[PDB]
Amino acid sequence: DSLYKDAMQYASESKDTELAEELLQWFLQEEKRECFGACLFTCYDLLRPDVVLETAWRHNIMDFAMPYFIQVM
């Protein structure tokens, strides 16, 4: 039920790995790219941009998500 940017807060405060990546992949299996960049920026300290770029660009979606990679740069 808490799909309006609430479970992202739990994943961020969890401070664990391999948790936010599942939410990112679910945001791509179903058309929910409107919150992909938000989930990236919130859980930046727990994600790996190298695989995030691949998953977001080549895997199952042609998404840009440029400000995230700008912050990475």
């Binding site: 695989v51 691949e54 080549r58 895997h59």
Partner: protein, 41 residues
């Protein structure tokens, strides 16, 4: 999607290539090949 299958059939970077020198760049290439492997459909 068939182009990726053709690239795999031509130059599949299988982990069997570990018989060569254990270079860090070759390990990174093996990891990239393992990450690209699920893309075959």
């Amino acid at each position: 999607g068939t182009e990726w299958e053709k690239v795999a059939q031509l130059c599949d970077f299988n982990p069997k290539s570990s018989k060569q020198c254990k270079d860090v760049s070759r390990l990174r290439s093996v990891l990239m090949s393992l990450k690209q492997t699920p893309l075959s459909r």
